[PDB]
Write a protein that binds this DNA or RNA. Structure first.
Ligand SMILES: [Mg+2]
Lengths: 49, 542, 78, 1327
DNA sequence: CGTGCCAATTTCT
DNA sequence: GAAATTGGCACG
C-alpha cells in the first residue's frame, strides 16, 4: 500500500497527454504534434514571452 | 509487493521489467543532478535531459514513440500501461474473470439411469470439493474434538467420512459448466450422486443445451457456498426449471437420436405380424402378450382404451372405447399422463411427433408432469431401441438397378454435345452450361430411383396374396424417423456423389458418379478434399 | 512473474487459532502468543510481556496461562 | 521368394495392380539434407565450403594483410549416441579449420609475402545427426522440421481489383532475393508507375532509372517506339506503318496516293490495313491539330541562339510547333502512345517525377532511406551502391537467378547474384507488357513458386551468420600492427559461432522435441512440412488461399493429413514418393508412355513441368504389355482433370497410393471414407500409446513393414549369420565367412533397450523375435520395439465388435466395454516418470546426501540404503523419501538453552536442515532406475561406484567374447602347426594350454596386450566425471514405473475417425452372445455411420470377421493333430482366393517344419492386406466368408445376456482394430477447496500440478447475469477468489455450520488503483 | 479563402 | 489485413 516518489531533476512531459491522437497538449497550446515533439526532445527552440 | 523480484533456484534474484525501468530512470536522474551541480557544459546537460525524458517515457508507456527498449531476450519490457491495458491486463484478466476455489473438472460420460435434476459426481472429487463441510459435520457429532483430528481423519480416509460425505451432499446443488459458454444454458445446477470412478456422468437430455458429446469433452463443477447461492441454484439455475429456450421459446429437452429410434420402431405396423387382429382388453394385456412372446410389437389389434379430457373447470372426465392400434402403441400409452388424447401416440413417432407431444403435455398439464414424462420417454426409448437389435450392414445401402443406364445416357448426351461444339455450333460457355445441366438432371434421376427403391418393400398379405408396405431398412429407419441422417447423406451413400466445386467456387463439369458403397478412384477423391478443406477452414476461422 | 504464497509455521498456527472456539479476549491473547514464536517453535518472550502487550488492566496471568496451555496442544504438539 | 521374417507369417494381399517402383526410404529427406551440409564439396556451394568461401579471405583496411582459408575437417565425437543420452550431453563433432595468415610488404602489394603462418584452429562443435534423422541436444532427441517458403525471384501479382472503389485492377511486381532488400514496382489509380524500396514510402518509378545514370532521351528510346514526322516543305508529313492504325478512330482526313483511304470520323478496319500493307503506304499529310497534344521525344535546340527550344517529354502546341518549325527543323520525334495497346505510362510518370538529373535522385533515395540527416553525395552513392550492387549485402541465389531468368524468358540459367540495369529494365518492361494485355499474373500458391528448406540449408545460414560476426571481430582486431608475434589462433574466437550454432539447434522454432509415442509419430514428425517459422507465414495473417488444396499438390503434399484448428493447411505432410530436386522444389515420379505402351521408365517431374504433359491415371487398365483398354482414358492436362484419347497421353501415375502420405496409407478402405473423417483418423492414429503386448492389425494395407523398419525402433541385422546367443537383453550373431573383414572375429552384438522413458513419459522396450541357432540374413529384424509385432507396425488390438444400441450406454459416441477386456490386460500401459535431486554448494558449507536425517523416524528411512538413496524395486507412494538430502544451517551463537538442546540429543541433530527429495502428492510407482552424476573432484559414494561396476561388467563381457573367439582360432592354429611338425594325439590334452612357432606365440601375447588396452580405454571413459553446472555437486535421478489400466473416461478410437469415451465396464454375463455362447468384447452405436459417412469401418468389420474365420479353422485343425497334407492344402486354398490378384504363394517350396510354423502364426486369424484405392472388392469378402463357414451377409443373430431372449433383428458383428489414445482420465480429473494463491493478485493459481482452481471467465459471468443469480455471482468474485479477509471468515463459518458470507472487497482492484495512480492520475473512492 | 481527395497513423481481431 | 481518424495538398 505504501508508494514512493522520485524528485526529477527537470520537468518531464507525460506521454499519455502528448502521444494520444487528440493531443491534449497540442490542442491546448494550438501547436502541431511535430513542433511539440521537436521542442520536447531537444531539436529546436521556442519563444516564451 | 506489487513488483516483486523472482527467486529461482541458485540464489538468483533476476530483476523484473518494472524494476529495470525504474533503475534506468533513477540512474539518469542522479547523473543529471550531479551534472547540474558541477556546472557542466550545456551540450552534455541537454543530452542528459533528452535521455531522462526518453527513460521516463519508456517507463510510463514503452514503445509508444518508437524503439521500445528490450531486455536480454530482445523482447520489449512491460510498462505500467502494458500492465493496465490489453487482453492480458488487469481489467480483462483479473477483474472481469477470475480463478475460483471449490471448483474441479473432469471428462464427462453418460448415465442413462439418472433423472434430469441430478448428475453423477466421483466420490474422490466430492471429498475435496466439500472438505470444510466435512470438517464441520465431523466435529459437530463428536467424532473429532479438534480441527486437526478431523483433518487427520479426512487425510487418511477412514470409513465414516464417506457416511459424513453422503450426509453433507444430500441436498446441495453443484453447477456444471462447459466452455465455451455461448448462452445461459451452458451453466446448470444438478444434485450430485456419488459414483465410483473419475468421470462425471451427465444426463442425456441435457446434452443438447450444452452442445456436448461424449468423445473427450470435459466439464467444470462449482460448489455454491452461502445459503442464498444454494437457493439460486435451486430456483433459478436448476436443470428442471429451464426446459424452454430463452431465444425463441421452444423446448430444449427433446429426445435426440436413439431415444426416438426406439419409439419409432415400437410405434409401427406390419401387414401380417404375429398375433394380429385379436381383441385386447387394455395396454396391460398388450404388454403381457408381448413379453410372453405370443404377439409382435407391430401387430394390428383392437384395444379398449380409456382416456381423460379436461372440462371447463379443469376436472378430468373419462371416455372408454375400442381403438384400432398396434401392440406397441398400447404399451406406450401406459406412459402418457392423464389429460392427453390417444391420437397423440396412435401413429409412427418420428422426431417431430415426439417434441410436439412434450409441448402438448407442457401446455395442457404443467411442469412436473412434463418432467416425469420426459424421463419416462427416455427410459422407454432406450429400452426398446436396445431390444430392437438394430444395426447397419453393407447390404443396407441398396444401389438402384437403373443407375448405370442413367449414367450411360448422360455420357451419350455429353458426347453428342461435345461433338456439336466441335462442329462450332455452340460457344464454349454455352456448352459448359448445358453439360452442367445434363449432369444435374442425371443426378436427380439417380436420386429419385434410389429413394423409390429404398423406401418400400413387399410382404405376403393375411391371405396368400402380396401387398406393399413401408421399408424396414435399417438406414431408411434412421433417416425417416429423424434419428440421425438426412436425404443428402443417404444419396451419397447409395447414389452418385454429384458435382464438386473448386476452391474458387466454379463447378467442375465432370462429376463424381461413385458412392461410398463403391469406391472413389484416386482422381475422384482429390476434389472432395478441396470441398472438405474449405468446409473445415471456414469453421476453424469463424 | 507473480509468485506464490507459502504456509509458514505461524500461518498454520493462526489457521487453527481462528478455528478454535475462543472468545474475543482469548483470541487477542492467542494472537500475541502465536506472534512470539520463532521458527523452532519455542516461545521467545515471558508471559509478562504478553500480558503487557494485551494492554488491558483486568486480564490476569491465569488467563494467559490457560490460553497458552491450549495453544501448546496444536499441530505440531509441543 | 520371401525373407526369413516375412516367411513366418505371410499377409494375404488383395492388391491387383503390379508395382513398378518400390517405396523409397521414408527418412531420406533429413539425411540427404544434412549430408550436403557435412560432406566435402570440391565446388564452393552446398555446405560449410560455401559458408567459408562466402566470407574468407578476411582482409584489413588497406593493411596489406589478410586471413585466408585452406580447408576444414570434422573430428570424432567423444561419446556415441547412447552414452550421450544416458550422460545428458550433446552428440556433436569438433570443427578444425586450417587457417592461414599472410603478411605482404609495404609499398609492394604485388611483392612476395614476407611471412606466412598456417595453423588449424578449433571453431566450436557442430551437432551431428544420428542414423534415424534426429539430433540429441541435452540427452533428448529433437527433430528440425522442413519449411515451405516463397522461392526467390520476380513475381508479378496484381491486386484483385478491390482496393480502388472503381474496381480498377492495379498490377505490380516484386523482386525477392535470398539475402537482401526488396524492390517493388506498382501502379496507381491514375495509371502511373511507381517504385517502392524495402516496403517504404512510394516514389516515382523513374528515380531508380535516373539513379542508374540514364537520361530522358534514352529512357524514351528504351520504353517507346519512335515516329518521325517529316516537314516536307509543309504541314508535318508523317512516316506511316500500317499496323499503327489498329484500334484507332481518325479525327482528321487520312489520304495518300490521291486516295482518301480513311475519312474524318472513320475508324480503320482490318481491310483498310491489308490494303495499306499491300500498297505500302508510308507518307501521310496531317493538319496541325493532330500534334496539339503529341509529346516530343528528345531535346531540340535552336541552331541560331543555341538555347533550349523545348525540354524533353512534354506535349507540343500550335505556338510551340511554329517556334520549332521556323528555326529550320525537319525531323520531329514522337512516341507511339495509342491508348489501347501501347499505353503512355513511363512518359507520363516522368511528369510527376520531380528531378531530371542523375545526382539528386541519390539524394532523394538517401532521404527516403535515412530521414532527418544531412545528405552527403559520397554517403548517398555508397548507400545506393550497397543496396542492390554489393556481393556482401545482396544475394540473388542460384534458385533466385534461375527463377528470375526463367520468368523474364531469358536463356541462361546461371548468372550473378547481384542485380544490374538490364534486369530492372526487363522487369519494368514485363510489368508494362502485362498492363498492356499480353501477360498473366502468377499465383503464389503454385508448388512451382514455393520451395523446401531443410535442416542443412538452415544450419549453413546460421553458420554464415556466426562467421560474419567472427569476420567483423577479425577485421577490427587486425588493424593493430603486431603481425610478427600473433598466430591465426589468436585472432578468431569460437564463442560466437558455437553460440549461434547451438542456439539454432536448441531454441529455434522448427527444432522441437520428437513425438515419441509411436513409430508412426516419429516417422511422420520427421516427414513434416511447415509453412510457419522464421521467414515464413504467421498463423493469424495466413488467410484463406494458402490453406487450400491446390491442383499441384497431387503426388507432392498429402491433402487429407493436416491438423484441424488454428493452423489447418499450414503444417501439411509430405507424400510417399515425393522428392526434392537440386533447387528444393517437390517432384514426383511418373511412368513414361511411348507409342501408347507404358515403358516402365521413371521420370521425376516437378510442378512446372507437370502442367505441359498429359498424364494418365493410376486406375487405368493395360493389357499385359501396356495398352489402355478404353480408348477414352482419364487424364490431367493443365491442372484440370478431363477425358482424353488413347494416343494423346505422355505419362502415367507410378502407383495408386502416391497421392496420400504415410499416415493416410495405413487406413484400410480409405476410398469408402468421407474426406472429413479420414483426416481425423489419420490424426488420431499417431497418438496411440503402446500397450503391454503388440497385436497385428489383421486387416492392413501392407505399409506396416516399411513404417516399422524405416523408423529405427526395431533391431535390424547389419550382416547375415547365425544367431549364437539369444537373451532378453542382448543378441549375439555369428557372421558368415563370406561377409567378414580380414583379420576379424566375426560377431555382431546387439544390446536391446529395456524399459527406457520416452519424451511422452511412456515406455520403450525391445524384445527379441529370433531363436537360438536359427539363420538370419541382412536386413531382417532381430528384436521388436514399442508397437511392433514381428517387424510389423501394431498400434492397437483386435476387438470383437457389434453395432447395436445397448440401453443408452453407447449414446452419442460413448463406448461400452466388456469385463474380459479388462481381465486380459489388453489396453494396460506402462508409464515412466523421472524425478531429480540436486545438491548444490552454499556459503555455510555444502549440502550432502545422507541416510540419517535428524528429525525423521526410523520407518521413513526403512527403504534407504547406506548412501541415502532409495532401493531399486521399492514401491513408493504418497510422500515417501526418495533421496535423503540435508542442507547445513550454521553460524548460530551458542546459548544455554541451545547448549542444553544440543547436549541431550547430540550435535548431529542440530545445525542441519532437511531438504530431502520426496514423491509428489498423488504419485506412485516402483523404483526401476537410479542415476548418479558427480562433478569431477567430488568423491563418489558407494552407490555411484556400484553403478559404475555394473556398467563395467558388460564391456568386459563383449571384449571377452571377441577375445575368446580370437584365442580359440589362434590356439587351434598353434595345435595344428605343432602336430604337423611332430604328431601328438593325447599328450597335448593333459599338457597346459600355454605349451615358426615362436612367431605364432608372439601373436598371442600381442593380442592379449591389445585386448587389455581396449578394456582400459573403456574403463577410463566409464569412470570419467561430469560437468554439471556452476555450484552443483551431485544430481540423483529416480525413475518410477506405473501400470495404467482401462476405466470409464478413457478415450479410444479407430482408424476411420470414430473416436469415443468408455462409459461402462459391463460384466461378461451381460454382454450379448451368439448361438455358441461367445460374448462380444465391445458394443458400438450404429447411429454414427450414416451421418459421418465413414463406411470403411463396416467393410473392415466384415473383412476382419472373414479373416478370423480362417484362423478359427486353422486352430481347429491344429488342436486335433492333423497331417501337414491337409494343413498346407487348406492354407493354399486360402492364399489362392481372389480375383486376378498379383500375389502368388506356393506352399510346395515350404518344408513341413515351415508350414507348421506358418500355421502356428495363422491360428489367431489370417492377416489381410487391402491397399488404399486398390483394396478388396465386396464380392471377395463374401468369398472369404464362405471359405470359413460364416454368413455371407456379415450379420448373425445375437441373444441378450440378461434376459436370454434373441434380439429381433440380425446385428453386425466382426473384428475391428481399436486404439487407445493418449487422453487418460487419470490426467484430467482435478479438484480444489483451498490452496496457494498468487502474490500481487491474491487469486488461486492455474493448472493441475499447482493444485489450481478453475477459471470463471467473462462468458460465464454473462451466463450468471442472464439467470439473475446475484449472490452466486458475488461469492465467485470476492469470497471464493480474491477477498483476503472474506476467505477466512467464509471458511470459519462453513466449519461452524453457518452458511453466510461478509463480502468485502477484492484485492485485485486495489492493485488496479495503485497501478493507475502510479501513472500520475488521481483516482480515488469517495463517500 | 473554403472543400474534398489522398497518404499516415492507430487499434482491432 | 480492415476500418476510422487526422494531417497535407490539389482545386475552385
Ligand atoms: Mg466432442
Amino acid at each position: 500500500e505504501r508508494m514512493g516518489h522520485i524528485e526529477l531533476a527537470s520537468p518531464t512531459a507525460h506521454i499519455w497527454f502528448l502521444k494520444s491522437l487528440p493531443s491534449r497538449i497540442g490542442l491546448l497550446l494550438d501547436m502541431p504534434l511535430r513542433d511539440i515533439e521537436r521542442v520536447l526532445y531537444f531539436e529546436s527552440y521556442v519563444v516564451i514571452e | 509487493d506489487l513488483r516483486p523480484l523472482v527467486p529461482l533456484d541458485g540464489g538468483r534474484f533476476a530483476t523484473s521489467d518494472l524494476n529495470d525501468l525504474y533503475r534506468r530512470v533513477i540512474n539518469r536522474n542522479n547523473r543529471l543532478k550531479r551534472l547540474l551541480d558541477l556546472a557542466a557544459p550545456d551540450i552534455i546537460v541537454r543530452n542528459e535531459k533528452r535521455m531522462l525524458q526518453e527513460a521516463v517515457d519508456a517507463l510510463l508507456d514503452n514503445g509508444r514513440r518508437g524503439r521500445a527498449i528490450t531486455g536480454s531476450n530482445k523482447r520489449p519490457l512491460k510498462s505500467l500501461a502494458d500492465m493496465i491495458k490489453g487482453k492480458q491486463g488487469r481489467f480483462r484478466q483479473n477483474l472481469l474473470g477470475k480463478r475460483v476455489d471449490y471448483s474441479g473438472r473432469s471428462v464427462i460420460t453418460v448415465g442413462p439411469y439418472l433423472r434430469l435434476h441430478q448428475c453423477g459426481l466421483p466420490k474422490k472429487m466430492a471429498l475435496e470439493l466439500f472438505k470444510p463441510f466435512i470438517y464441520g459435520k465431523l466435529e459437530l457429532r463428536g467424532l473429532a474434538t479438534t480441527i486437526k483430528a478431523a483433518k487427520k481423519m479426512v487425510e487418511r480416509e477412514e470409513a465414516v467420512v464417506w457416511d459424513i460425505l453422503d450426509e453433507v451432499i444430500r441436498e446441495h446443488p453443484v453447477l456444471l459448466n462447459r466452455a465455451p459458454t455461448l448462452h445461459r444454458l451452458g451453466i446448470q445446477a444438478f444434485e450430485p450422486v456419488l459414483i465410483e470412478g473419475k468421470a462425471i456422468q451427465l444426463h442425456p437430455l441435457v446434452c443438447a443445451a450444452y452442445n456436448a458429446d461424449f468423445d473427450g469433452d470435459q466439464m467444470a463443477v462449482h460448489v455454491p457456498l452461502t445459503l442464498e447461492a444454494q437457493l439460486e441454484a435451486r430456483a433459478l439455475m436448476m436443470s428442471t426449471n429451464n426446459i424452454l429456450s430463452p431465444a425463441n421459446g421452444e423446448p430444449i429437452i427433446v429426445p435426440s437420436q436413439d431415444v426416438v429410434l426406439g419409439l419409432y420402431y415400437m410405434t409401427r405396423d406390419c401387414v401380417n405380424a404375429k398375433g394380429e387382429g385379436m381383441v385386447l382388453t387394455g395396454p396391460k394385456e398388450a404388454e403381457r402378450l408381448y413379453r410372453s412372446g405370443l404377439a409382435s410389437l407391430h401387430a394390428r389389434v383392437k384395444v379398449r382404451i380409456t382416456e381423460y379430457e379436461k372440462d371447463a373447470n379443469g376436472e378430468l372426465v373419462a371416455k372408454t372405447s375400442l381403438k384400432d392400434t398396434t401392440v406397441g402403441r398400447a404399451i406406450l400409452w401406459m406412459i402418457v399422463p392423464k389429460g392427453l388424447p390417444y391420437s397423440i401416440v396412435n401413429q409412427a413417432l418420428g422426431k417431430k411427433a415426439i417434441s410436439k407431444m412434450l409441448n402438448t403435455c407442457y401446455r395442457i398439464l404443467g411442469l412436473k408432469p412434463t418432467v416425469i414424462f420426459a424421463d419416462q420417454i427416455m427410459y422407454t426409448g432406450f429400452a426398446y431401441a436396445a431390444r430392437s437389435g438394430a444395426s447397419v450392414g453393407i447390404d443396407d445401402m441398396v444401389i438402384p438397378e437403373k443407375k448405370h443406364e442413367i449414367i450411360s445416357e448422360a455420357e451419350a448426351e455429353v458426347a453428342e454435345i461435345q461433338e456439336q461444339f466441335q462442329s462450332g455450333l455452340v460457344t464454349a460457355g454455352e456448352r459448359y452450361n448445358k453439360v452442367i445441366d445434363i449432369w444435374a438432371a442425371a443426378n436427380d434421376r439417380v436420386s429419385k430411383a434410389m429413394m423409390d427403391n429404398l423406401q418400400t418393400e413387399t410382404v405376403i398379405n393375411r391371405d396368400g396374396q402380396e401387398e406393399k408396405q413401408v421399408s424396414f431398412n435399417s438406414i431408411y429407419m434412421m433417416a425417416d424417423s429423424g434419428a440421425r441422417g438426412s436425404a443428402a447423406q443417404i444419396r451419397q451413400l447409395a447414389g452418385m456423389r454429384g458435382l464438386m466445386a473448386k476452391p474458387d467456387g466454379s463447378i467442375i463439369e465432370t462429376p463424381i458418379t461413385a458412392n461410398f458403397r463403391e469406391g472413389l478412384n484416386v482422381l475422384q477423391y482429390f476434389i472432395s478434399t478441396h470441398g472438405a478443406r474449405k468446409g473445415l477452414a471456414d469453421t476453424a476461422l469463424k | 512473474y507473480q509468485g506464490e504464497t507459502t504456509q509458514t509455521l505461524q500461518d498454520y498456527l493462526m489457521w487453527q487459532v481462528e478455528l478454535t472456539p475462543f472468545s474475543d479476549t482469548d483470541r487477542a491473547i492467542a494472537t500475541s502468543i502465536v506472534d512470539a514464536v520463532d521458527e523452532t517453535g519455542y516461545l521467545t518472550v515471558p508471559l509478562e510481556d504478553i500480558l503487557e502487550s494485551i494492554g488491558d488492566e483486568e486480564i490476569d496471568i491465569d488467563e494467559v496461562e490457560a490460553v497458552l496451555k491450549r495453544i501448546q496442544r496444536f499441530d505440531p504438539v509441543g | 521368394v520371401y525373407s526369413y521374417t516375412e516367411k513366418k507369417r505371410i499377409r494375404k494381399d488383395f492388391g491387383k495392380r503390379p508395382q513398378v517402383l518400390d517405396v523409397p526410404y521414408l527418412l531420406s529427406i533429413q539425411l540427404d539434407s544434412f549430408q550436403k551440409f557435412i560432406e566435402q564439396d570440391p565446388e564452393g556451394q552446398y555446405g560449410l565450403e560455401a559458408a567459408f568461401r562466402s566470407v574468407f579471405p578476411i582482409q584489413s583496411y588497406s593493411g596489406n594483410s589478410e586471413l585466408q582459408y585452406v580447408s576444414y575437417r570434422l573430428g570424432e565425437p567423444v561419446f556415441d549416441v547412447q552414452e550421450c543420452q544416458i550422460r545428458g550431453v550433446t552428440y556433436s563433432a569438433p570443427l578444425r579449420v586450417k587457417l592461414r595468415l599472410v603478411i605482404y610488404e609495404r609499398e609492394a602489394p604485388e611483392g612476395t609475402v614476407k611471412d606466412i603462418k598456417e595453423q588449424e584452429v578449433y571453431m566450436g562443435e557442430i551437432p551431428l545427426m544420428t542414423d534415424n534423422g534426429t539430433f540429441v541436444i541435452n540427452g533428448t532427441e529433437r527433430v528440425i522440421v522442413s519449411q515451405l517458403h516463397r522461392s526467390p525471384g520476380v513475381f508479378f501479382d496484381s491486386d484483385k481489383g478491390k482496393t480502388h472503389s472503381s474496381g480498377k485492377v492495379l498490377y505490380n511486381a516484386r523482386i525477392i532475393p535470398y539475402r537482401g532488400s526488396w524492390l517493388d514496382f506498382e501502379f496507381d489509380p491514375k495509371d502511373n508507375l511507381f517504385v517502392r524500396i524495402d516496403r517504404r514510402r512510394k516514389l516515382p518509378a523513374t528515380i531508380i532509372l535516373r539513379a542508374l545514370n540514364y537520361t530522358t532521351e534514352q529512357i524514351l528510346d528504351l520504353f517507346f517506339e519512335k515516329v518521325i514526322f517529316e516537314i516536307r516543305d509543309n504541314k508535318l508529313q508523317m512516316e506511316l506503318v500500317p499496323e499503327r492504325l489498329r484500334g484507332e478512330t481518325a479525327s482528321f482526313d487520312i489520304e495518300a496516293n490521291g486516295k482518301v483511304y480513311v475519312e474524318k470520323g472513320r475508324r480503320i478496319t482490318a481491310r483498310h490495313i491489308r490494303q495499306l500493307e499491300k500498297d505500302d503506304v508510308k507518307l501521310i499529310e496531317v493538319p496541325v491539330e493532330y500534334i496539339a497534344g503529341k509529346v516530343v521525344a528528345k531535346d531540340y535546340i535552336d541552331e541560331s541562339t543555341g538555347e533550349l527550344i523545348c525540354a524533353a517529354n512534354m506535349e507540343l502546341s500550335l505556338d510551340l510547333l511554329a517556334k520549332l518549325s521556323q528555326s529550320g527543323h525537319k525531323r520531329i520525334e514522337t512516341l507511339f502512345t495509342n491508348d489501347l495497346d501501347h499505353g503512355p505510362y513511363i512518359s507520363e510518370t516522368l511528369r510527376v517525377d520531380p528531378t531530371n538529373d542523375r545526382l539528386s535522385a541519390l539524394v532523394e533515395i538517401y532521404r527516403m532511406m535515412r530521414p532527418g540527416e544531412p545528405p552527403t553525395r559520397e554517403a548517398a552513392e555508397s548507400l545506393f551502391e550497397n543496396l542492390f550492387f554489393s556481393e556482401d549485402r545482396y544475394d540473388l541465389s542460384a534458385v533466385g537467378r534461375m527463377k528470375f531468368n526463367r520468368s523474364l524468358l531469358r536463356e541462361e540459367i546461371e548468372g550473378s547474384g547481384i542485380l544490374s540495369k538490364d534486369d530492372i529494365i526487363d522487369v519494368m518492361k514485363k510489368l508494362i507488357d502485362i498492363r498492356n494485355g499480353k501477360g498473366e499474373v502468377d499465383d503464389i500458391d503454385h508448388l512451382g513458386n514455393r520451395r523446401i528448406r531443410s535442416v542443412g540449408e538452415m544450419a549453413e545460414n546460421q553458420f554464415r551468420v556466426g562467421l560474419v560476426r567472427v569476420e567483423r571481430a577479425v577485421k577490427e582486431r587486425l588493424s593493430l600492427g603486431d603481425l610478427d608475434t600473433l598466430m591465426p589462433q589468436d585472432m578468431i574466437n569460437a564463442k560466437p559461432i558455437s553460440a549461434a550454432v547451438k542456439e539454432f539447434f536448441g531454441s529455434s522454432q522448427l527444432s522441437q522435441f520428437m513425438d515419441q509415442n509411436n513409430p508412426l509419430s516419429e516417422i511422420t514428425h520427421k516427414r513434416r512440412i511447415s509453412a510457419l517459422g522464421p521467414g515464413g507465414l504467421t498463423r493469424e495473417r495466413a488467410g484463406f488461399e494458402v490453406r487450400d488444396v491446390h491442383p499441384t499438390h497431387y503426388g507432392r503434399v498429402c491433402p487429407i493429413e493436416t491438423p484441424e484448428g488454428p493452423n489447418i493447411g499450414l503444417i501439411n505432410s509430405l507424400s510417399v514418393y515425393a522428392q526434392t530436386n537440386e533447387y528444393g522444389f517437390l517432384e514426383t515420379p511418373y511412368r513414361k508412355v511411348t507409342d501408347g505402351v507404358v515403358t516402365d521408365e521413371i521420370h521425376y517431374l516437378s510442378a512446372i513441368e507437370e502442367g505441359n504433359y498429359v498424364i494418365a491415371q493410376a486406375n487405368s487398365n493395360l493389357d499385359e504389355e501396356g495398352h489402355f483398354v478404353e480408348d477414352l482414358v482419364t487424364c490431367r492436362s493443365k491442372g484440370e482433370s478431363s477425358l482424353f484419347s488413347r494416343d494423346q497421353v505422355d505419362y502415367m501415375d507410378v502407383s495408386t497410393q502416391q497421392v496420400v502420405s504415410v499416415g493416410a496409407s495405413l487406413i484400410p478402405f480409405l476410398e469408402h471414407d468421407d474426406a472429413n473423417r479420414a483426416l481425423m483418423g489419420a490424426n488420431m492414429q499417431r497418438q496411440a500409446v503402446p500397450t503391454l503386448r503388440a497385436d497385428k492389425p489383421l486387416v492392413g494395407t501392407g505399409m506396416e513393414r516399411a513404417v516399422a523398419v524405416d523408423s529405427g525402433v526395431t533391431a535390424v541385422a547389419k550382416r547375415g549369420g547365425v544367431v549364437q546367443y539369444v537373451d532378453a537383453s542382448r543378441i549375439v550373431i555369428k557372421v558368415n565367412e563370406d561377409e567378414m573383414y580380414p583379420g576379424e572375429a566375426g560377431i555382431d552384438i546387439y544390446n536391446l533397450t529395456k524399459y527406457t522413458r520416452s519424451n511422452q513419459n511412456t515406455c520403450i522396450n525391445q524384445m527379441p523375435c529370433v531363436s537360438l541357432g536359427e539363420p538370419v540374413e541382412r536386413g531382417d529384424v532381430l528384436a521388436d520395439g514399442p508397437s511392433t509385432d514381428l517387424g510389423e507396425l501394431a498400434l492397437g488390438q483386435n476387438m470383437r465388435v457389434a453395432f447395436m444400441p445397448w440401453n443408452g450406454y453407447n449414446f452419442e459416441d460413448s463406448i461400452l466395454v466388456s469385463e474380459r477386456v479388462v481381465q486380459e490386460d489388453r489396453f494396460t500401459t506402462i508409464h515412466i516418470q523421472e524425478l531429480a535431486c540436486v545438491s548444490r554448494d552454499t556459503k555455510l558449507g555444502p549440502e550432502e546426501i545422507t541416510a540419517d536425517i535428524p528429525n525423521v523416524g526410523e520407518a521413513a528411512l526403512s527403504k534407504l540404503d547406506e548412501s541415502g538413496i532409495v532401493y531399486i524395486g521399492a514401491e513408493v507412494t504418497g510422500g515417501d523419501i526418495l533421496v535423503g538430502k540435508v542442507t547445513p544451517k550454521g553460524e548460530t551463537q551458542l546459548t544455554p538453552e541451545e547448549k542444553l538442546l544440543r547436549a541431550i540429543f547430540g550435535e548431529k541433530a542440530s545445525d542441519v536442515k532437511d531438504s530431502s527429495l520426496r514423491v509428489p502428492n498423488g504419485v506412485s510407482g516402483t523404483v526401476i532406475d537410479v542415476q548418479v552424476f558427480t562433478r569431477d573432484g567430488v568423491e563418489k559414494d558407494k552407490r555411484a561406484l556400484e553403478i559404475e561396476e555394473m556398467q563395467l561388467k558388460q564391456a568386459k563381457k563383449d571384449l571377452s567374447e571377441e577375445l575368446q573367439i580370437l584365442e580359440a582360432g589362434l590356439f587351434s592354429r598353434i595345435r595344428a602347426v605343432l602336430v604337423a611338425g611332430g604328431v601328438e594325439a593325447e599328450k597335448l590334452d593333459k599338457l597346459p594350454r600355454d605349451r615358426q612357432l615362436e612367431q605364432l606365440a608372439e601373436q598371442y601375447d600381442e593380442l592379449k596386450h591389445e585386448f587389455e588396452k581396449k578394456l582400459e580405454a573403456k574403463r577410463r571413459k566409464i569412470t570419467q566425471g561430469d560437468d554439471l553446472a556452476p555450484g552443483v555437486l551431485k544430481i540423483v535421478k529416480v525413475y518410477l514405473a506405473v501400470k495404467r489400466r482401462i476405466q470409464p473416461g478413457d478415450k479410444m478410437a479407430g482408424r476411420h475417425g470414430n473416436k469415443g469415451v468408455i462409459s461402462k465396464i459391463n460384466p461378461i454375463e451381460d454382454m450379448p452372445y451368439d448361438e455358441n455362447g461367445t460374448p462380444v468384447d465391445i458394443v458400438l452405436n450404429p447411429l454414427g455411420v450414416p451421418s459421418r459417412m465413414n463406411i470403411g469401418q463396416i467393410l473392415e468389420t466384415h473383412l476382419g470377421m472373414a479373416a478370423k474365420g480362417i484362423g478359427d479353422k486353422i486352430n481347429a485343425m491344429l488342436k486335433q493333430q492333423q497331417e501337414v497334407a491337409k494343413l498346407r492344402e487348406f492354407i493354399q486354398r486360402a492364399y489362392d482366393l481372389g480375383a486376378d490378384v498379383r500375389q502368388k504363394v506356393d506352399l510346395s517350396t515350404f518344408s513341413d517344419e515351415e508350414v507348421m510354423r506358418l500355421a502356428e502364426n495363422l491360428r489367431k486369424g489370417m492377416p489381410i492386406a487391402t491397399p488404399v484405392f486398390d483394396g478388396a472388392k465386396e464380392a471377395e469378402i463374401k468369398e472369404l466368408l464362405k471359405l470359413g463357414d460364416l454368413p455371407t451377409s456379415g450379420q448373425i443373430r445375437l441373444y441378450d445376456g440378461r434376459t436370454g431372449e434373441q434380439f429381433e433383428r440380425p446385428v453386425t458383428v466382426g473384428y475391428m482394430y481399436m486404439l487407445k489414445l493418449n487422453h487418460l482420465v487419470d490426467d484430467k480429473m482435478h479438484a480444489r477447496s483451498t490452496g496457494s494463491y498468487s502474490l500481487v493478485t491474491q487469486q488461486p493459481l492455474g493448472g493441475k500440478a499447482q493444485f489450481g482452481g478453475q477459471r470463471f471467465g467473462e462468458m460465464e459471468v454473462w451466463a450468471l447475469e442472464a439467470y439473475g443469480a446475484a449472490y452466486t455471482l458475488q461469492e465467485m468474485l470476492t469470497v471464493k477468489s480474491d477477498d483476503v479477509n472474506g476467505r477466512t471468515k467464509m471458511y470459519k463459518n462453513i466449519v461452524d455450520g453457518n452458511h453466510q458470507m461478509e463480502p468485502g472487497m477484492p484485492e485485485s482492484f486495489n492493485v488496479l488503483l495503485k497501478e493507475i495512480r502510479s501513472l500520475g492520475i488521481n483516482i480515488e473512492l469517495e463517500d
